[PDB]
Amino acid sequence: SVKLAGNSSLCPVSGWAIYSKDNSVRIGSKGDVFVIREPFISCSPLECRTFFLTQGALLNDKHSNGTIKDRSPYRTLMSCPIGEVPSPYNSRFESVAWSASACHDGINWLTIGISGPDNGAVAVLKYNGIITDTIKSWRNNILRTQESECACVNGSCFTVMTDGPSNGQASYKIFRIEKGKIVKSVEMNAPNYHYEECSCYPDSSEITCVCRDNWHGSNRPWVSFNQNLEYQIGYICSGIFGDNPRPNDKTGSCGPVSSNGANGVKGFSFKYGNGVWIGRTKSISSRNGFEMIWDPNGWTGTDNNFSIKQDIVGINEWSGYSGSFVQHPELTGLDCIRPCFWVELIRGRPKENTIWTSGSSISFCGVNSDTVGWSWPDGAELPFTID
Amino acid sequence: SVKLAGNSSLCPVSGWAIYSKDNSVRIGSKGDVFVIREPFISCSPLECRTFFLTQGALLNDKHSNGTIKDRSPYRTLMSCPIGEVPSPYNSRFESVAWSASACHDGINWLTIGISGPDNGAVAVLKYNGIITDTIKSWRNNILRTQESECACVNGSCFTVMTDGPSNGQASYKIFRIEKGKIVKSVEMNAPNYHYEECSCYPDSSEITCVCRDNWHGSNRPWVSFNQNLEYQIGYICSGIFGDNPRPNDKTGSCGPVSSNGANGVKGFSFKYGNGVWIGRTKSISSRNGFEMIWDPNGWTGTDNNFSIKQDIVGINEWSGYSGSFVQHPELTGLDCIRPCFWVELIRGRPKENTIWTSGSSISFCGVNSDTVGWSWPDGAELPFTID
Amino acid sequence: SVKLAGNSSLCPVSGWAIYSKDNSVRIGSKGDVFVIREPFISCSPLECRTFFLTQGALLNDKHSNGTIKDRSPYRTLMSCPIGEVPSPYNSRFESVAWSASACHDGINWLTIGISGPDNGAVAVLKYNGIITDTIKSWRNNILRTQESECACVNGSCFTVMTDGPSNGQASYKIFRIEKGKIVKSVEMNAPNYHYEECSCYPDSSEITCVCRDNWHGSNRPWVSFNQNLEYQIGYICSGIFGDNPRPNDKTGSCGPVSSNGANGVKGFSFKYGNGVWIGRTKSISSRNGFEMIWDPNGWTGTDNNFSIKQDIVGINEWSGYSGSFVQHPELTGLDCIRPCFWVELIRGRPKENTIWTSGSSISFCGVNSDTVGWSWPDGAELPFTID
Amino acid sequence: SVKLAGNSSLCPVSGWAIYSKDNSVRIGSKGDVFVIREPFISCSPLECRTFFLTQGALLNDKHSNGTIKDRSPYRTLMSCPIGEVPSPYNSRFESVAWSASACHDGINWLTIGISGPDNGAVAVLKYNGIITDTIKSWRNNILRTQESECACVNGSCFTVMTDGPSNGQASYKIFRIEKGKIVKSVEMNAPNYHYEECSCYPDSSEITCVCRDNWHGSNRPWVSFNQNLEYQIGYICSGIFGDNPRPNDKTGSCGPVSSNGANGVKGFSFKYGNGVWIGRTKSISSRNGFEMIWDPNGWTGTDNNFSIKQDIVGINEWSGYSGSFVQHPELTGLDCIRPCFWVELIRGRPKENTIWTSGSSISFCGVNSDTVGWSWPDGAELPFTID
Ligand SMILES: *[C@@H]1O[C@H](CO)[C@@H](O[C@@H]2O[C@H](CO)[C@@H](O[C@@H]3O[C@H](CO)[C@@H](O)[C@H](O[C@H]4O[C@H](CO)[C@@H](O)[C@H](O)[C@@H]4O)[C@@H]3O)[C@H](O)[C@H]2NC(C)=O)[C@H](O)[C@H]1NC(C)=O
Ligand SMILES: *[C@@H]1O[C@H](CO)[C@@H](O[C@@H]2O[C@H](CO)[C@@H](O[C@@H]3O[C@H](CO)[C@@H](O)[C@H](O[C@H]4O[C@H](CO)[C@@H](O)[C@H](O)[C@@H]4O)[C@@H]3O)[C@H](O)[C@H]2NC(C)=O)[C@H](O)[C@H]1NC(C)=O
Ligand SMILES: *[C@@H]1O[C@H](CO)[C@@H](O)[C@H](O)[C@H]1NC(C)=O
Ligand SMILES: *[C@@H]1O[C@H](CO)[C@@H](O)[C@H](O)[C@H]1NC(C)=O
Ligand SMILES: *[C@@H]1O[C@H](CO)[C@@H](O)[C@H](O)[C@H]1NC(C)=O
Ligand SMILES: *[C@@H]1O[C@H](CO)[C@@H](O)[C@H](O)[C@H]1NC(C)=O
Ligand SMILES: *[C@@H]1O[C@H](CO)[C@@H](O)[C@H](O)[C@H]1NC(C)=O
Ligand SMILES: *[C@@H]1O[C@H](CO)[C@@H](O)[C@H](O)[C@H]1NC(C)=O
Ligand SMILES: [Ca+2]
Ligand SMILES: [Ca+2]
Ligand SMILES: [Ca+2]
Ligand SMILES: [Ca+2]
Ligand SMILES: [Ca+2]
Ligand SMILES: [Ca+2]
Ligand SMILES: [Ca+2]
Ligand SMILES: [Ca+2]
Ligand SMILES: [Ca+2]
């Protein structure tokens, strides 16, 4: 086994080829499939896995009742091979968690699972499934992390955590982790910024994270840093606003866009110089639809012009969280780090008249060969028999 | 790991010994078994797997409703060990796909999965589960491929794809693929021919494909080619017509037989000089029954005489698609490439009064020791509880 | 990997320690468990597996209807780790079969599966899951084999097959098989003998089989042979009669005991010089109960005295088939071949008012440390919901 | 593979970080989950597994009826990866057993499973799944063992067994086992002591066991010994009484505390010099709640003062058995033996109006980084459909 180098650049890509679809909710109508939310994908040098937060219950069973609820002692982080439904019969147990991150350094899996009370939550770090560290809430207000993969470079893995209000100034910390041990952390000096649920990826030995401002930004905040945790911060400038909810596209800002800025959804974007690939919902007001947009000056420019749009999920279909994942040269044999992404397709409450909330997933990888837009939605027929 | 040589000749065989039976539909009456169609078998140097197109739903569940439908965003290519039922608990995810092929070059699996809209479908190629190439519809009319294994020789794998009408002249291309990458393709110059759903196998370093003419042939078209994609084309001459539907046996043609020529079913045949092993339905009008026929001059001769017939499925039982698969010397230790075949046993719509359509499978391998004809049908009792 | 030597003697044992219990029928009341019968155990140098003939259906489903029937095209030989329930989710597919045998030579698994019509059945032999030979019915009257493990010595494996009447003189052949290929066979010259369902084990480089006389013997016939298939035949002499049905114990015979001799059950015994360990039902008239009896002169002596009796299943509980299996020094590290045995616990028809018939299993291994008699019965409560 | 050394000291710890939660009962409402009780965790150098005694039945099925019953021929010891629900689809079969222990010596698993009649039970010992020894009841009164992991040092593993009354003086033996073979045993000379269900761990080459006195002690008895089985005995002195039931905390005793001393629950404690980490229920009268208490002089001192309390399960929630497990340096890379523990969360009879009794589990590992108390209860809603 060898550490992932993480020193090559992100592969430029012209479109997105479909990689996986699990059909979890459709299958769970009969099969034994976990009620889940907050899924994400992460790869080792050998395989790619879907991680997810269970609700300690199965679809179409009474224990799925009330699963709109975000945090409980029953939620667990588990994983299964990409594209398979999350079932008790094919899933690896990772951690007890209502917020999580995970990533592979080339040698072993790092998992981070946060559980405990809202006023004193504890992140448990594991390396190869053995507890290696913990970090406890420092603001006593829902310690929370990425809900997507952490990022690794040369044996060090990096993540971001938040503690404090979701509707005002909070506290954001970056962590450097080696063999599951926190070896350095820094608090970001980001007055007037808000960071939640960062999607972080490696690119030329440094980490870029695109996150969710739940306080007052309808564009997405970003933070980038080197292995020594020297960081920079900003917001994506494009008038192609990335959050949900958001206003109709118009002139943007390199600071937080206040219009429709409260609340949000976990998302991601890939930076290429001044340009950016933005993944976003199609609806400006609800978690519906998904599309990928290439905006060649969208990282630093405020106009609402863009060059490419690719459909992923139709506007009349449910979407949800989305996040980046990468495939390193050690896995692919390429000379660059390949960008991929996943989308959570949320079914049930609050929009649908069920007793439960759960998601399925789709994923795509970037390529420079021909691609096509379409809609690959969840496809389940609600309500279910338990409803 | 070593590349399959693919340079020995096809083993001559006198009969077919039963190899597998999954009983998928019988078992799915209670168990958690995927609704599937278009199954096929393919082997590595170590094992044989059943590939199949799911409908993203389980048998005896409401989401099986309407599964007579051929293409949707929910269909996925998955695989499991040969003879096992396709379940979410034992199946490997391969690709999102409503048309597919797969084969192992001795090192890794190649999978090809076509998804997207009818007017712009995209084939996603994976090698060891990593996306390696794509090819997009060139006629904007249901890009489609084998629904059986591709064929590999010395590290190159080969397949055929079609784009265009199913009731008139279409476009047919041959592809050479190395480590999941298309390295060469050619369009077949086949005016008045129609090719779909080719069953292709290697034989002495060259590829032979026997396919389905849905336009105007009740005999089967074939195409054979070397590693440089220099090809020859024709139709099986035998008056023992191979397609379904078809006329009663009589004098055949080395061109497309127009009588009952429209429509068809995926099938296969094995060429041995002027002779041919033909697998076909027993019914001339419907997908019922299956038999293997040895016709010693049937490749090139038009008479309706034959030498051996072996029963596989009784005429009063449902059959469906069939296809070739081979076992290379690297797997068997033999000094020739062994021919095997599978049969899809289709249950449900349109012939039966159910809300769903799904198949089970049987397979056989060629031998020169004693064999026997019989009927190994699906055996499920319809309708099901859900109907 | 190395061939099993098979040259050490059978370990003498004073009692039987319980090794496994699967509770298949109890579990199948809810879980997805195959309807099975004719289970048996066989070991490699690394693990022990339960083989079984499915009925291509699950317990408590309508397709379990009529499963008292012995032969059909739906029956398949499959296997799972010892002690686990036979489910579609944990079972390896082996062969299509309504009669079977299997054994590991130290390198790979040999499986033998007989399918086809009663008047022309074909045994398909596989080595490492690849078809290596076939043998076809020579009397056109239900070709049939052990329903327990074959026996291996120095890279050669041995089995017995029968063809002909079950109520009169039939034909019995011994086979020597190497890497799945029949390299020698001989027909036993056994006028007035009847052999079915042999339980064969290796002992000092030679094979001993104890079988079922369905024609006219309530004691068990035996055949022993060396690697060159030079054989001897006889019947177990003990007045402790081994078959079911049978008379009450009395003076026995070294030939077939005619009293209650018609019909029978698959069983086994272990020879130790003049002595014998006999496994048998407790009831003389029905497949109820099970016990192990040590009779120190029972192989060659006709008296009805014995020295040890150990209870296995109570007389008021259902039993069924039983068979030997061994654990070689290559697996155990012992300096002798260890005798073990399994018992099939049959539930359903004809004795119970259900639509189905299925079995669970228990197994035991011989030891010289302390043991105890008890009853470890099936434990399912019939009828089931489907009945 | 290398033997565990077992020669380093127990890691001192300040708190307990949550390690696993299986949600078995919640999931078994729909999924195929074993009815179980007496679960425990044990690790190899590579992984940690949950062992458990099934009732040979699944949750929400009629065969779960009467499972309050402790011993039957249907109970089996099985195991699955830690944190996964115990299902027939993910569980390894270990032994037929209604009382058990297991542990890994660094090379292979030792399992001990006791079955048979109350008046003559037999413990079957397996090493790598092969029977290696047996030991039979010596007092003919429910031979019984730990229901948690045995302890290994330098290739020798150690356990404790009891035979005799649960309401008066019984007999207690210590065993030294090498490669599954009993190489030494001694009977403890413990008049007026009572030992059941010992929780034993290694610490500096010696074994410490903390057990259950069901006769007349509401504090816990202990026994410690070296590899030669030279032992010492006593009771935990702390006025923080460890058993359930028990009196309210007050001045304790270094002998058995008679007040509320009859009956009990399996538990554990970790000795650190004069100090002790005590895990106990929160209720003094019933199996409800769980907490960890650090009492710096509680091993040898009788006062009821303590320094740290950490909540694990709320007082209004069901708990049950608890036990120690360790993680050796060979697994963790640490320079000490890490203490962890599990808690069984018992649902059903006798406290709840169901036909069945079953448990789920949680586990924690000791650390010196920040931790938090909370309640991680079972969470199932009773009764179930079957009730
Ligand atoms: C699989 O699919 C088939 C086909 O969809 C499905 O059978 C259909 O069931 C639906 C719903 O029960 C039926 O739809 C009804 O049709 C009647 C006329 O026959 C209408 O009167 C009904 O409409 C009234 O009620 C609606 C709901 O309250 C109102 O919205 C509407 O305005 C009317 O007031 C309704 O449309 C339909 O008849 C059948 N179709 C067929 C061909 O049988 C089947 O149930 C599905 N199977 C499973 C397992 O899901
Ligand atoms: C799990 O076990 C419990 C306890 O066994 C079980 O509840 C029991 O159900 C049985 C069967 O329904 C009940 O037995 C009946 O009791 C009544 C008196 O209350 C008797 O009159 C009945 O006997 C008559 O009918 C029998 C059958 O026809 C005749 O054989 C008999 O001679 C009489 O004519 C019968 O015994 C019993 O009352 C309950 N017991 C309790 C405590 O509730 C439960 O059903 C089981 N659960 C599952 C899921 O299997
Ligand atoms: C990336 O890291 C690898 C592995 O250490 C190193 O060999 C290589 O020089 C680096 N690549 C570049 C482009 O600097
Ligand atoms: C969901 O939970 C609520 C709160 O306990 C309860 O009232 C209701 O019965 C539950 N609904 C279902 C369908 O179980
Ligand atoms: C087939 O290929 C193998 C492997 O390269 C080669 O050694 C051999 O010469 C070829 N066999 C024949 C018969 O040409
Ligand atoms: C058994 O076979 C082994 C392996 O070949 C051989 O070494 C040994 O001599 C034989 N044992 C006896 C007792 O003859
Ligand atoms: C069993 O099969 C018979 C014969 O077809 C049929 O009449 C009956 O309905 C079946 N019984 C059940 C319970 O399915
Ligand atoms: C513990 O055992 C190891 C392995 O044998 C040995 O090397 C070492 O000396 C021991 N450690 C201590 C602290 O005694
Ligand atoms: Ca926002
Ligand atoms: Ca722009
Ligand atoms: Ca045609
Ligand atoms: Ca001819
Ligand atoms: Ca007989
Ligand atoms: Ca005698
Ligand atoms: Ca089910
Ligand atoms: Ca007590
Ligand atoms: Ca104290």
Numbering used by the authors:
A (entry chain B), B (entry chain A), C (entry chain B), D (entry chain A): 82 to 169, 169A, 170 to 306, 308 to 333, 335 to 336, 339 to 392, 394 to 412, 412A, ...
Excerpt from the publication:
NA, which is a sialidase, catalyzes hydrolysis of terminally linked sialic acid and functions as the receptor-destroying element of influenza A and B viruses. Additionally, influenza A NA is further classified into two groups: group 1 (N1, N4, N5 and N8) and group 2 (N2, N3, N6, N7 and N9), based upon primary sequence. Group 1 NAs contain a 150-cavity (formed by amino acids 147–151 of the 150-loop) in their active site, whereas group 2 NAs lack this cavity. NA inhibition assays were carried out and complex crystal structures were solved for laninamivir, laninamivir octanoate, zanamivir and oseltamivir in order to elucidate the structural basis of their inhibition.
Laninamivir octanoate complex structures with p09N1 and p57N2 were solved at 1.6 Å and 2.2 Å, respectively, demonstrating that the laninamivir octanoate prodrug can also directly inhibit NA without further processing. Surprisingly, the p09N1-laninamivir octanoate complex shows a completely different binding mode: p09N1 adopts a Glu276-Arg224 salt bridge in its laninamivir octanoate complex, forming a hydrophobic pocket that is also necessary to accommodate oseltamivir. The rotation of p09N1 Glu276 places it out of range for hydrogen bonding with the 8-OH and 9-ester-O of laninamivir octanoate. Instead, the p09N1-laninamivir octanoate 9-ester-O forms a unique hydrogen bond with Asn294. Additionally, 09N1 Ser247 forms another hydrogen bond with the laninamivir octanoate 9-ester-O at 3.4–3.5 Å. Still, the Glu276 rotation results in less hydrogen bonding in the p09N1-laninamivir octanoate complex compared to p57N2. Furthermore, in p09N1, the position 7-methoxy of laninamivir octanoate is also oriented slightly away from its N-acetyl group relative to laninamivir and there is additional electron density pointing toward the ring, indicating lower stability of the p09N1-laninamivir octanoate complex. In all of our NA complex structures, bond distances in each molecule of the asymmetric units are very similar, however in the p09N1-laninamivir octanoate structure some greater differences are observed between molecule A and B in the asymmetric unit, which further reflects the lower stability of the prodrug's octanoyl ester in p09N1. In p09N1 molecule A, the distance between the 9-ester-O and Asn294 is 2.64 Å, however in molecule B the distance is much further at 3.93 Å. In a similar manner, the group 1 Tyr252 side chain promotes the native His274 to occupy a position where it can participate in a hydrogen bond network with Glu276 and Arg224 as observed in our 09N1-laninamivir octanoate structure.
